[PDB]
Amino acid sequence: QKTPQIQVYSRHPPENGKPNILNCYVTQFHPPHIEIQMLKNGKKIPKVEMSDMSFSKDWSFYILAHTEFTPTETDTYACRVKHASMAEPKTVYWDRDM
Amino acid sequence: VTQSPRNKVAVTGGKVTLSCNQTNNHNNMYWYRQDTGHGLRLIHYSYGAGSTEKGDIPDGYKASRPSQENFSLILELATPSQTSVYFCASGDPQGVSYEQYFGPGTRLTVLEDLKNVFPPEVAVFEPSEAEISHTQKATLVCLATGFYPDHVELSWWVNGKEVHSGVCTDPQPLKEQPALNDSRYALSSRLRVSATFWQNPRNHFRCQVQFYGLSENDEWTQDRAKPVTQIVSAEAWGRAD
Amino acid sequence: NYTFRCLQMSSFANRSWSRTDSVVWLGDLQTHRWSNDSATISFTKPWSQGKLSNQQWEKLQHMFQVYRVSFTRDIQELVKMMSPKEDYPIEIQLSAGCEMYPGNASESFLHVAFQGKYVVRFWGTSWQTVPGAPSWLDLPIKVLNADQGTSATVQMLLNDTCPLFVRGLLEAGKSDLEKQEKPVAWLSSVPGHRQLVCHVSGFYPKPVWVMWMRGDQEQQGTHRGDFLPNADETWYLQATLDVEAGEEAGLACRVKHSSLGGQDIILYWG
Amino acid sequence: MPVEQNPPALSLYEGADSGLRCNFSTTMKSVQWFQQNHRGRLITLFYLAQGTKENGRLKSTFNSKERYSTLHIKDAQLEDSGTYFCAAVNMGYKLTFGTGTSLLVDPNIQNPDPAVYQLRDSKSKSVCLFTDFDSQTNVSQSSDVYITDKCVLDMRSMDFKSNSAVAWSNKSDFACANAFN
Ligand SMILES: CCCCCCCCCCCCCCCCC(=O)O[C@H](COC(=O)CCCCCCCC[C@@H](C)CCCCCCCC)CO[C@H]1O[C@H](C(=O)O)[C@@H](O)[C@H](O)[C@H]1O
Ligand SMILES: *[C@@H]1O[C@H](CO)[C@@H](O[C@@H]2O[C@H](CO)[C@@H](O)[C@H](O)[C@H]2NC(C)=O)[C@H](O)[C@H]1NC(C)=O
Ligand SMILES: *[C@@H]1O[C@H](CO)[C@@H](O)[C@H](O)[C@H]1NC(C)=O
Ligand SMILES: *[C@@H]1O[C@H](CO)[C@@H](O)[C@H](O)[C@H]1NC(C)=O
């Protein structure tokens, strides 16, 4: 059993009030059954698109979730992940500065 | 009902004699010839020993009924027009029936010169690995070449026994050089087996070509071997590869 | 030099619940997908059929449909044979495909993993356990090897079908395989030491050079992260530098890539 | 023509039920049906002076007044292939044969895979093979290249009923591709 690694990054340089794509790369997990939510100010984003699940040379699974988002001064964007290898769901926040 | 010979090669002008025999003790005996777009046409017939009646196409043929059992058809001066398949049949009036009982058939070939008679050269072409991989099947190819006249019989023999399953053969032969009056012939045949069956080295494949040429009665002056009625074969052993 | 990979993801939760999913890659580009909820393999590129005819592809797809149903039912039985020794949930992953080289050279493979550990391969004309595999796998292997029909199929797909297909695919999609996407960089920082970050995104292909510079001098403190993908089959890379306060002045981030044509991106820290 | 046989050629699938007809220009005393095999042998199927006759998968009827005779084939097999002759007895007790009906029983080729293969010889030329095509496939001709027509399956063949054509040439090296277009 392997615990997932979550990485949250934007596709284009983040410009407040300009449409962008937020990406959430989830890797190094096993079994493949995972649940990924993308949240804008704690609420689940509705038309979230997800890549086809694939695996690496080490046989661990990887998947990418992405959504259209518009960064602002007021809004907070996060990626929540549930996996058997974790007792409590892990949340990673998007920090434009990271 | 039997016929003798079953195949005959003659020269234009030669004296040919086709015989028929029946043991059923039938009164009537008939002589027919088969050609395309004509079916079978009656040449001569007989109602008993010592009697013979002209059929529909009797010109160029004579017939003798020496006894009840035998009825003969004679071609005193043979012509290429008489190159045909001759069928003989018997009819029994004493059994209140018009039913006739036909012989196996005799093929006759009238030629200008006997020096043009050629036996066939047989070759077996092993299946392509491309077919064996793709279809998981294997076709062998028998190819009879350079024989004259056009009639030949082709059969496949796997491990000494004749096979019919997976056999496909051409209906007629093809002229090797049609721009020639004395042109030799070619005929092919296929044998399809399961890929593994061919791939087995313990399986022996052999196609057999039965040529119908000259008799020991005919005279031969050429340096080449007499192109007599013979069997010419080509063989192949299955290979793993 | 390009690698073709068919990835299978089979899951068996219990005797009445199963799920199979597959993806196909040509290098770091996806050519096909096939989820459990779909009846046929889906092309993810306009060239995904390669140089195969519609009839050649129809026959190949049909053989994969039969394989998916057979695979599920065959593994569900092997468990009935293995238990109590093996129990649900069971994860099975297949990694097939052929590596491509210049000329006519090729090397095909079919690797199988049980519960994440590589246990079996298709070698020569049969399935065989690899070193380290557990002893209970000997019996299912003999059950799988009695299927001479499948061995002939896999032998045709690995030996002939895979190199032929990929060679057609590399010609059909060379415009996509040789695409050059210009990266876009930007700088940011996190907090008496700060951490400066240089984000590099949308570049294609993978080889990129990112360094924090101070003049013509490379900063050896540059920590270059992992390659993470963007949704449009382009890459994202970030390079960080840990600096003492006030020494951020004069720092720049230089980006080198094939698509820029010897004209590096140089971003100055202000 | 006193014995009119139609069609001259018939081509039916395996397991199909078909029938052959024989028409007469006058009132005939009897009828006799024959099957001529691919080996040239004539074998009597039926002899009738009246009524119907059934002999397994075959049936024959003779109507003197309606000037016809029929031959029915129930569930056609390879063994049914060959020329079917119809001969009636005319005034003057003369058996008259019709031109014939050549029969060809074809298997139902389900998944056609048209292909061309090059076969190497057993001794030390080369042959091309066009196989796994359908029934609605016509084989071409043409010049120092020889191409066979669709072959005729063995009447006793019980498996591997795949029709094919063969091509060869005097020329070497011969292009296997440019042979069947
Ligand atoms: C996708 C784009 C096209 C690219 C083409 C390149 C293809 C090359 C990639 C090759 C992909 C490999 C797929 C396999 C193909 C087989 C096939 O494609 O062959 C299949 C046979 O499937 C079966 O009946 C059996 C399936 C199960 C066998 C799988 C092995 C099980 C995995 C074990 C090892 C795990 C052991 C762990 C035990 C622990 C549990 C115990 C607790 C389907 O093929 C069948 O049907 C075809 C047809 O109808 O057209 C026929 O043509 C064919 O002859 C026949 O075998
Ligand atoms: C596919 O390629 C393999 C090679 O990886 C072939 O395997 C050899 O096959 C022969 C005959 O079956 C054996 O004697 C060898 O021992 C095999 N080699 C190995 C490494 O096991 C295989 O035959 C090929 N299959 C096809 C259908 O061509
Ligand atoms: C089988 O597995 C599914 C998914 O894990 C589960 O929801 C279902 O209740 C299971 N059924 C049984 C009978 O165990
Ligand atoms: C996968 O597809 C098969 C198709 O028959 C179905 O029976 C099975 O329930 C599917 N599983 C899931 C979880 O979608």
Numbering used by the authors:
A (entry chain D): 2 to 99
B (entry chain B): 5 to 245
C (entry chain C): 7 to 197, 202 to 280
D (entry chain A): 3 to 126, 129 to 146, 149 to 187
Tell me, in the authors' exact words, what the paper reports.
To gain insight into the mode of recognition of the A11B8.2 TCR for CD1d presenting a microbial α-linked glycolipid Ag; we determined the crystal structure of the unligated TCR and the A11B8.2 TCR–CD1d–α-GlcADAG ternary complex to 1.7 and 3.0 Å resolution, respectively. The electron density at the A11B8.2 TCR–CD1d interface was unambiguous and unbiased electron density was clearly visible for the headgroup of α-GlcADAG. The docking strategy adopted by the A11B8.2 NKT TCR was in clear contrast to the orthogonal docking mode of the type II XV19 TCR atop of the CD1d–sulfatide complex (docking angle ~100°). Instead, and reminiscent of the classical type I and atypical NKT TCR–CD1d–Ag ternary complexes, the A11B8.2 TCR docked parallel over the F′-pocket of the CD1d Ag-binding cleft (docking angle ~15°). The CDR3α (24% BSA) and CDR3β (24% BSA) loops contributed the most to the TCR A11B8.2–CD1d–Ag interface and to a lesser extent, the CDR1α (13.5% BSA), CDR2α (9% BSA), and CDR2β (9% BSA) loops were also involved in the interaction with CD1d–α-GlcADAG. Accordingly, the non-germline-encoded CDR3 loops dominated the interactions at the A11B8.2 TCR/CD1d–α-GlcADAG interface. While the overall position of the headgroups of α-GalCer and other microbial-derived Ags (α-Gal–GSL, BbGl2c and α-GlcDAG-s2) generally lays flat in the central region of the Ag-binding groove, the α-GlcADAG carbohydrate headgroup clearly leaned markedly towards the A′-pocket of CD1d. The TCR–α-GlcADAG interactions were exclusively mediated by the TCR α-chain, namely, the germline-encoded residues within the CDR1α region (Thr29α and Lys31α), and the framework residue Lys67α. The positioning of the A11B8.2 TCR α-chain indicated that the CDR1α loop would sterically clash with the headgroups of a number of CD1d lipid Ags, including α-GalCer, sulfatide and microbial-derived ligands, consistent with the lack of staining of the A11B8.2 TCR+ cell line for CD1d tetramers loaded with such Ags. Further, and consistent with the crystal structure, mutational analyses indicated that Met87, Glu83, Lys86 and Val149 were critical for CD1d–Ag recognition by the A11B8.2 TCR, and that Leu145, Thr159 and Ala152 also played a moderate role.
We have identified a polyclonal NKT cell population that can recognise the microbial glycolipid α-GlcADAG presented by CD1d. Here, using α-GlcADAG-loaded CD1d tetramers, we characterise a population of type II NKT cells that are selectively reactive to the α-GlcADAG Ag presented by CD1d and do not recognise α-GalCer. Thus, this study defines how a microbial-Ag is recognised by a type II NKT TCR, and demonstrates that type II NKT TCRs can bind with diverse docking modes to CD1d–Ag.
